[PDB]
Design an enzyme around this catalytic site. Structure first.
Site, PDB file in Angstrom:
ATOM      1  N   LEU A 158      48.730   5.332  74.657  1.00  0.00           N
ATOM      2  CA  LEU A 158      47.159   6.367  74.599  1.00  0.00           C
ATOM      3  C   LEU A 158      46.663   6.306  75.658  1.00  0.00           C
ATOM      4  O   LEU A 158      45.519   6.649  75.872  1.00  0.00           O
ATOM      5  N   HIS A 159      47.298   6.153  77.111  1.00  0.00           N
ATOM      6  CA  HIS A 159      46.846   6.281  78.321  1.00  0.00           C
ATOM      7  C   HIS A 159      46.775   7.629  78.761  1.00  0.00           C
ATOM      8  O   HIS A 159      47.499   7.574  79.858  1.00  0.00           O
TER       9      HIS A 159
END
EC number: 3.1.-.-
Length: 187
Positions: A28-29
């Site tokens: 989820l970067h």
RNA sequence: CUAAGAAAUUCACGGCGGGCUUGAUGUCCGCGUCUACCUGGUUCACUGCCGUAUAGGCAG
């Protein structure tokens, strides 16, 4: 380094370790992937390898302006109602060895390795003898999951960071920008 | 430290001729199976990968 940040994900049903909150820890970067931004220092402040999770909060190591007002990407959504939120602060004044975050450290090479085993003009009977499966071996990479097109639930991850320096500066840039070698916050 | 202590049963053989098991039969009749629930515990430790070399905008 110059301005270390944090992001608290509150406890709830939807953020448990199964697939609503397992896979949002190493994939989820989007602030360093899709939402805008590529030059930060990945330094997760919860590097505890006992549970295989190298980050508890949303620890990010940035500069002073990048932590105060230059970190407004879409990689910090969901903590408006389904969790808490953080803000920017100063960098590590002492010598913190927080050169470890979400970086390009991982050992999933078996996703495409037949070209390194039996796709070199040979048959498929050399997928472990010519080029073995030793790089496509899952190990204890302490890192949250990923939610890409590899499973409907979360996935595996790793920590592509190492030691951290003693001064205040963003370190080297890996795939995840993991700021290893720079004196980021230790935790 | 033993109802201790020991031990080759072997060779050979034709089972075989024959047979009508038949006749007849009403299974009836009655019933409430309900009450609740997150599959987000990865359907390949992965689906494509530069060199199997924790090498990645890895599509994470």
């Amino acid at each position: 380094m110059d301005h270390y940040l944090d992001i608290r994900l509150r406890p709830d049903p939807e953020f448990p370790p199964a697939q609503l909150m397992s896979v949002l820890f190493g994939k989820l970067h989007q602030a360093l992937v899709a939402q805008g931004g590529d030059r930060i220092g990945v330094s997760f402040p919860d590097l505890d390898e006992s549970r295989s999770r190298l980050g508890e909060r949303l620890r990010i190591h940035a500069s002073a302006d990048d932590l105060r007002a230059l970190l407004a990407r879409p990689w910090l959504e969901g903590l408006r109602d389904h969790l808490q939120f953080g803000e920017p602060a100063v960098v590590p004044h002492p010598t913190p060895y927080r050169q470890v975050s979400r970086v390009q450290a991982k050992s999933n090479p078996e996703r495409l390795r037949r070209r390194l085993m039996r796709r070199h003009d040979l048959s498929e009977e050399e997928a472990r003898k010519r080029i073995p499966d030793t790089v496509a071996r899952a190990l204890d990479l302490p890192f949250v999951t990923l939610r890409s097109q590899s499973t409907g639930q979360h996935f595996r991850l790793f920590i592509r960071h190492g030691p951290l320096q003693v001064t205040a500066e963003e370190g080297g840039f890996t795939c995840y920008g993991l700021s290893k070698g720079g004196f980021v916050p230790w935790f």
